[PDB]
Amino acid sequence: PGSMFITFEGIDGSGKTTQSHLLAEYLSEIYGVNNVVLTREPGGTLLNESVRNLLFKAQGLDSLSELLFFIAMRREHFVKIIKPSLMQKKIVICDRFIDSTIAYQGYGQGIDCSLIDQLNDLVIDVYPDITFIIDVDMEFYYRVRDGFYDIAKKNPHRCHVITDINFVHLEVIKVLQM
Amino acid sequence: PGSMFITFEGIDGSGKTTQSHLLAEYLSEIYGVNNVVLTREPGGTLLNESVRNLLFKAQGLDSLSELLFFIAMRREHFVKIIKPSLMQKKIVICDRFIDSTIAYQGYGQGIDCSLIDQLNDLVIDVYPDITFIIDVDDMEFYYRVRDGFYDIAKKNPHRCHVITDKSETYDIDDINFVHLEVIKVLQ
Amino acid sequence: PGSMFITFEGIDGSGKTTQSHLLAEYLSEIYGVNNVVLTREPGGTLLNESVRNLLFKAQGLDSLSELLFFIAMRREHFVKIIKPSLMQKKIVICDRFIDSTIAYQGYGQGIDCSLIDQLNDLVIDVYPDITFIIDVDDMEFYYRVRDGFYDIAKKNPHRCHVITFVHLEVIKVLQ
Amino acid sequence: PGSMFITFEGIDGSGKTTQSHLLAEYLSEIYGVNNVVLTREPGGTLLNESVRNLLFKAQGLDSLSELLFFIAMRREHFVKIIKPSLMQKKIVICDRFIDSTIAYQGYGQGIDCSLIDQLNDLVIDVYPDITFIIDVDDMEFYYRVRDGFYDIAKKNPHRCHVITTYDIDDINFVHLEVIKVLQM
């Protein structure tokens, strides 16, 4: 149908995942299940999902290690799923992407955002057409949220912040179709 | 006893692993088993070993992805195992490290060596004191890798020592010969 | 969605593992894969899995030592996996937990059950909301453990429910 | 020859390991190698040394998990090595034991020393006859551990001996002091 690359972002528990599924079902009804690819990071391939399970069972990663695993995984997910889907003119919807890395590894853990930008640019050559930031150690979580707000202000050509399951879905479609 | 970070490098089938084990035994006898830490990459921690087994079954992994997995594992390994052992003034021997990555990911796979240097410096803050590159006396890929090890040796003469695997004057089995050369560099 | 801590228990071969997966699938379809943590003991973390493998090849390990290894693993598992998942309002499904230790190490091996209780209360601060014991048909040893699971249920009726298709009962009881 | 349970204690780098080997050699010369059992914690059996290697490669244990691993390993070590040796009237020398756990897990990490005492008494039913604490020269953690060893020495004045000019090595000085204390 023509490539489109949509991402959902925000804090865990914000309803990102639910919204990404609701969009997938909506777009699938219009363009056909085969033309819509619903995926997620960290994950999206068998390898990545398997690495994700290991990381979950390890905990206690150095923060830069964690960043680097997420960048490796993104590279693999981009090359195998995202970019070939786009080359084939499908719609890709990804639950968590480059903005989560900035928010969590950058603002949260304190890793330099210019490094994270460089790493993201090293591994992908297509950025999302549109990103929906769903807005719903407390000091950590305040930083992460500030990161998402800053991302939205830095990238208003791409990011749209939707505030506070059906209402949110309706605004997602509204914004998507302008 | 005194911190000392020693790495073994070279193409696969070169005897790096054997030489690393032999030196570990040699130095353990002198300094005590507690003061010699033998490790390897990719690996070194339970997570890294598990990730290594996954990667070993991965079909057609993008070379840039593979580099980044190795750099992530290196970070883990450095922070958990290598740096704290050297802080405790121990000898660390690592079978494969930063030079394998330049030779394989850079020369082999064509990834920018300057990027790989940057990624390595990003993840470690202590370089090996001594690196033994064990030299064996698609094939184009193999030969690029070999070239990579030689250029690293030429670019790092302080740190690296190329040890050839053939006794030129005495009749000595190759494994013992190389080991004796390794011990010789340490004097 | 809301924290819920569910354990499956029973003798080896009871089908508790199969049931734990099936409940995970059923709940994952309702609340999302990300809000359902499927885990197990002994295990749950890479360290615990490696230690478990060692314990499996250990010949004639002192039973109190073995108890303490399983208690150290449970603590690690609880701190790293179970508690943080529950704090994030997720559902945790654990295949084997505190009751397995009571049945195998207390009733089976003869270690004082009140010691086992004390060690369990030392390492965890959240008990399961519901425990499903799946029931099936040296045997003296095996019968004491089986009986152990009945007796635990009897002492903890507010928490344990014994099941004698099995999956449909689990879902009906959970509702 | 006679049951004797000796331990060596102190912070890492203090020379505990070296002093335990030297004492093992000295006593093996007098009583015979078969009558002196040199061992260590955490470790001392194949299972324990394998667990130790896994702990090294996992890092970032909860402090209570770590304690409990060390206690499980102590139980196994006591049952298989220490108690049978003492029952045979041999001399047992252990590099690190109950006092390390108090200093590190208790004073260092903050776990209640009473809990540690109860866990120790759960797994062993004899204390060392003599314990040599070798006193050597995040830093907060370090200072707490060192303080713990001093407190242990004060609370156990019978069992514990803190060892701190002659024309010899520090290693040999400490070794001779250990021998001298032993002849009392």
Swiss-Prot record, chain B:
Q: Could you tell me what reaction this enzyme catalyses? A: dTMP + ATP = dTDP + ADP
Q: Name one GO cellular component term.
A: cytosol
Q: Cross-referenced CDD domains, in alphabetical order?
A: TMPK
Write the Enzyme Commission number(s) for this entry.
2.7.4.9
Gene3D superfamilies, per the entry: P-loop containing nucleotide triphosphate hydrolases
- SUPFAM superfamilies in alphabetical order: P-loop containing nucleoside triphosphate hydrolases
Give the record's keywords alphabetically.
Answer: ATP-binding, Kinase, Nucleotide biosynthesis, Nucleotide-binding, Transferase
Kindly report, in one word, the top-level EC class recorded for this enzyme: transferase
Question: Residues that bind ATP, according to the entry?
Answer: G10, I11, D12, G13, S14, G15, K16, T17
Q: Which GO terms describe its molecular function?
A: ATP binding; dTMP kinase activity
GO biological process, alphabetically ordered: dTDP biosynthetic process; dTTP biosynthetic process; dUDP biosynthetic process
Which Pfam family is an annotated match for this chain, by its short name?
Thymidylate_kin
Q: Which family does it belong to?
A: Belongs to the thymidylate kinase family.
What biological function has been recorded for the protein in this entry? Answer: Phosphorylation of dTMP to form dTDP in both de novo and salvage pathways of dTTP synthesis.
| HAMAP family in alphabetical order | Thymidylate_kinase
What's the protein here called? Thymidylate kinase
Which organism does this record belong to?
Answer: Ehrlichia chaffeensis (strain ATCC CRL-10679 / Arkansas)
